[PDB]
């Protein structure tokens, strides 16, 4: 016994507050968004909308997503990328109609794939600006062979699924660009995380559904690993 | 013409190298190898504190050796009393990424900062009993990595834009700005007499700074990679540095050269925090191998090992009266050793 | 380059001592307060709050 | 199990043939010795890993440790039984040990069954509904573990309140649970054994089979992402294997038990004992097969075990 009466009151109040905060916190999902300057990550952000780092929130089917965009920083990022070791997905947005800065995009993807603190995190890949790619290939004033000559040996796979109305040439181009990233993804053979590709444009409204489905699959694989079933 | 200036710089560097090699008359492993070895030092956990939901990024002891502050990526500050494991304060943050803490020498204020490019200064003694933000300092262009106090009127700050600064609380304006580094500044420490301070900035380099002047006094080189932690020897004329090449080193301030290099062949990991003890004999360090080591300063050998954490050791500290040592790691638990 | 030249010029003119002097000072400070460190010389259990 | 008429007791001709034959003096001890030598260290190592080097208490470890302990306690007093069988069906070791042996054998067998069922249900609850909480699961796991153990220690009492050893002079033998009086097989024991056979096998069997079938049917649906096949397919295989080691090793024993007691209490003869001995031999092999299906087909557990030794 003593005169110390706050020694129970303050502890109990603070414990109650932290319990409520824990129950609020553990039901949210957190995503990190990366891209380059000419990528259209800002337009995507503005579309599913409804200094330091920018922050957005959205809700799908009564599940809350919390997404982080890196803002006014310097060019070198090898030191603060370690503060993101507990997120579920990295959303990587890459341009598709430039042909020049594409190699730097692949190299950055390779760098973020093999980092030591990010060997248990998966990547969702968005390829932006597709209609520009279609128009540019149909114009035919520039040949992809000047930057990837191996395209001269590429043919459409037999299991192609093109939407009706598309020339096979644009389909071939799209699938080659996808194939480069997928090969760099599977090169390690680590078998602990996966890459999910998609095609997207400047005006589309189904991006939240895609993120939801992919996150659901990621959680399921985590649970299968955890319970000695796989 | 850019040729004459580089030639002069090379000549000055050669002169400095000759001056440093002239004073290198012996190695201190020769005049410190006939002392009584400290022995075997083993420690055990006396208490364990729970309540954080995520990783602990930093902590600090007060001036009474009783009260402490800690903070996590939850957006939470917690102020503990370690005599009885009971909580006294909890404060929520306006941002969820915070990377440094502090504790005022008078027990009235605390300070914080993170990726939000801003410092936040909180008052603790109010008539209403509700902790509400007092001041907010902006003006940097990069993540803020450390902040300490001199009195209740000045705060020294270090950021990732290769610069350091001194701030005056009342006006809210910078009073002096320190430039001269080339990379990310990470670690900062204040002199015990509150007259000078020391910084290290991811170029394998370290520098000494005067507060009232605003210019470098001396620059030390010798590591191979980034520098992550820094601390003063108790007496005020030495500092010991830790880097990402698996090495600790000791420097003085009057000889401008390396004295002891502490390392081992079986270590290929990094150093996350470093601190000293009161007499000056025990040097504690936390590693990425999920443990901590205790070393002796004048001998360049090992004394003991502390284990018990399931992830990286991120923050470490030793009290002002020498009674206990506190540690915090990415598993969301703080521990106290004596 | 001019800034580097100025930095090297100001750093060049510094009085320096011999290493053994600093070694002696450090070992002296280690010896002087050897008895008051509560970790080299463990405190009796009676007066230890921990 | 065999009927002895009427204290000096007597038995008939087929019983005399079996009790002095080569099935119960040569075959059984081989099986028991092999099971003992293979299975003792396996569960020992598994329990060591689950007790010492575990850093966080996930629910799966909570159930698996209890299952391993059940097998370990099942497999202790076998040497007494091999000594019994090799000496020629004769017991010279007292009275308390007969009760100890019978009780521990049957109780530990059924505890193993119940824990398998609990693992199945929690797997369904996680996979087919991804949302859950770990700490509430830890609390529920500890509660249900206590409930299961306390239930077991309450249906092995009737085996400690019946004399189990009986003397036959015609052959000069003393018997532990192979010969029993007629005025007890037709009465209390009939009720007890059918109660166990229909109470703690069939209902858990339906639960487990339903859970695993629904899990497979959901994992092969045409509403799942196609970038994961190589993992999901593997999962299916393991599930099937587990069902295989459940129904094959347990259904024959309970079926033949019911049939045996029905013949005794319906007509009054007994000629199905050898099949029951062999089916029980088959049932006791899961003390050696479980650690290779629930513990070692993983990734991290093997590394932890290698680090342990």
Numbering used by the authors:
A (entry chain A): 13 to 62, 205 to 253, 264 to 394
B (entry chain B): 3 to 340
C (entry chain G): 12 to 61
D (entry chain R): 37 to 42, 57 to 359
Quote the study on this structure.
For the PAR2/Gq complex, a miniGαs/q19 construct, which contains the crucial Gq sequence for receptor engagement, was utilized, whereas for the PAR2/G13 complex, a miniGαi/1320 construct containing the N-terminal region of Gαi2 (residues 1–15) was employed. In the PAR2/Gq complex, the density of the Nb35 region is notably lower than that in other parts of the complex. Consequently, we opted not to include Nb35 in the complex model. Our previous studies on receptors capable of coupling to multiple G proteins suggest that polar interactions play a crucial role in Gq and Gs engagement, whereas hydrophobic interactions are the main driving force for Gi and G13 engagement because of the distribution of hydrophobic and hydrophilic residues at the far end of αH538,39. Consistent with this notion, we observed that polar interactions play crucial roles in the PAR2/Gq interaction; specifically, the backbone carbonyl group of V394G.H5.26 forms a hydrogen bond with R2846.32, and N392G.H5.24, E390G.H5.22 and Q385G.H5.17 form hydrogen-bonding interactions with S3488.47, H1082.37 and S2786.26, respectively. We also observed hydrophobic interactions between αH5 (L393G.H5.25) and the TM3-TM5-TM6 region (M2655.61 and L2886.36). The binding poses of TL in the Gq and G13 complexes are very similar, with minor differences noted: (1) the carboxyl group of D62N-term faces TL in the G13 complex but turns away in the Gq complex; and (2) the side chain of I39TL3 faces D62N-term in the G13 complex but turns away in the Gq complex. With respect to D62N-term, in the PAR2/Gq complex, the carboxyl group forms a hydrogen bond with the backbone amide group of E63N-term, whereas in the PAR2/G13 complex, it forms a hydrogen bond with S65N-term.
Protease-activated receptor 2 (PAR2) is a transmembrane receptor that is irreversibly activated by proteolytic cleavage of its N-terminus via extracellular proteases, resulting in the release of the tethered ligand (TL), which binds to and activates the receptor. PAR2 plays a pivotal role in the inflammatory response and pain sensation and is a promising drug target for treating arthritis, asthma, and neuronal pain. Combining functional assays with structural analysis, our study revealed that TL forms a parallel β-sheet with the extracellular loop 2 of PAR2 to engage the receptor.
